[PDB]
Every structure is written in C-alpha cells, then in structure tokens.
Amino acid sequence: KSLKGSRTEKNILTAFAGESQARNRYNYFGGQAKKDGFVQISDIFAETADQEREHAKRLFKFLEGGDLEIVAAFPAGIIADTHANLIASAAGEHHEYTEMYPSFARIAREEGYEEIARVFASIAVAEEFHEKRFLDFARNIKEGRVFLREQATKWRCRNCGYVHEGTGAPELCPACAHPKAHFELLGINW
Ligand SMILES: [Fe+3]
Numbered sequence: 238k239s240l241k242g243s244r245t246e247k248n249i250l251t252a253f254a255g256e257s258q259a260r261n262r263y264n265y266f267g268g269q270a271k272k273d274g275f276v277q278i279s280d281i282f283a284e285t286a287d288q289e290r291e292h293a294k295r296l297f298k299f300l301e302g303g304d305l306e307i308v309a310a311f312p313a314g315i316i317a318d319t320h321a322n323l324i325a326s327a328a329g330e331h332h333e334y335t336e337m338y339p340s341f342a343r344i345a346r347e348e349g350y351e352e353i354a355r356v357f358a359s360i361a362v363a364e365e366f367h368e369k370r371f372l373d374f375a376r377n378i379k380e381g382r383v384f385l386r387e388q389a390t391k392w393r394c395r396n397c398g399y400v401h402e403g404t405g406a407p408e409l410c411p412a413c414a415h416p417k418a419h420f421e422l423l424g425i426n427w
C-alpha cells in the first residue's frame with residue numbers, strides 16, 4: 238500500500254537525511270585518517286561511507302515523490318583527530334542500531350509496511366558491525382597497537398602487497414618505499 242501521510246514515510250526520509258550526512262562525515266574522517274597516517278583506517282571510513290550511500294539508496298527508492306518536511310537532530314560538526322572521529326562515528330552508529338532503526342521498524346510494522354520494516358532491521362545489523370570496526374580501531378590507536386603488537390605476526394603493505402613478519406610494521410616498506418602508515422595486519426577472509 239501507499240506511504241503517503243504515514244509516519245513511516247517521514248521516517249524513511251529522516252533516515253535518508255541522516256545516512257546522507259554520515260556518508261559525507263565518513264569521507265571527511267577518511268581524509269583526516271590519511272593525514273594522521275592511518276591508511277587502513279582511512280579506507281575503512283571511505284568504504285563505510287560508500288555503504289552509507291547504499292543504505293540511503295535502498296531507503297530513497299521507497300519514496301513516492303514530492304517534498305516532505307522533517308524535524309530531526311544531527312551532528313553539527315566536527316572534524317577532529319582520527320581517534321576522536323572514530324569515537325564519534327561509533328556513537329552515531331550506536332544511536333542508529335539501538336534507537337533509530339529499531340523504532341522506525343516497529344512503527345513500520347505497526348502501520349502495515351512489513352517489507353520496509355525488514356529493511357530498517359537489516360540496515361541496523363550493518364550499522365552494528367560498522368560501530369564495531371570503529372570502536373576496535375579507536376581502541377588500537379588508544380593502546381598504541383595500530384602498528385605494533387605483542388607477538389610476531391604478519392603485516393601487509395596496502396600500497397604494494399609486501400608482507401612483513403615481525404612484532405611491528407616497518408618504518409618504510411622495503412618494496413615500494415611508502416611509510417609505515419600503509420601497513421595493516423595480514424588478513425585472510427576466504
Ligand atoms: Fe553505518
């Protein structure tokens with residue numbers, strides 16, 4: 238059935254507005270992560286931003302046209318150091334999967350928009366992992382574990398793929414000569 242005049246219709250636009258802002262914020266934080274010398278974290282912000290773009294698109298496609306007024310609160314700024322940015326992003330993700338989406342889904346179901354409710358719930362799942370990544374990375378920075386670990390492990394240069402074995406990432410990649418900032422823990426998800 239139609240969405241016109243429903244609360245869900247307005248909830249969809251409100252989410253779209255918030256997701257759109259998060260996309261920009263994450264891309265800016267990514268640029269800052271690059272300046273602070275954290276390449277992996279920078280690309281995570283950029284990818285998260287791209288995923289926000291997709292969450293927004295799914296929501297956008299439900300809308301039926303015309304202008305709609307919304308009343309909502311959003312973060313007015315700001316861009317700080319990468320650790321602080323990761324913390325603020327995690328807070329944003331948290332509000333989204335614990336408060337906004339669950340509420341929007343419940344209301345969607347209440348008004349008879351089951352498919353939409355399912356999407357709200359599904360998106361929330363993606364946001365929870367987003368928060369997890371942000372929180373884990375913020376913790377790695379706080380504990381000085383981004384480029385150094387307790388036991389010897391494998392480090393991979395994101396720029397050229399060189400693999401380094403040791404307790405910490407090298408100051409310079411011996412293959413491409415790029416700085417330590419480009420290294421991450423060698424990952425295998427397949
Ligand atoms: Fe997210």
Ligand SMILES: [Fe+3]
Pocket residue numbers: 394395396397398399410411412413414415
């Ligand atoms: Fe390299």
Ligand SMILES: [Zn+2]
Pocket residue numbers: 256288289292293360364
């Ligand atoms: Zn999202």
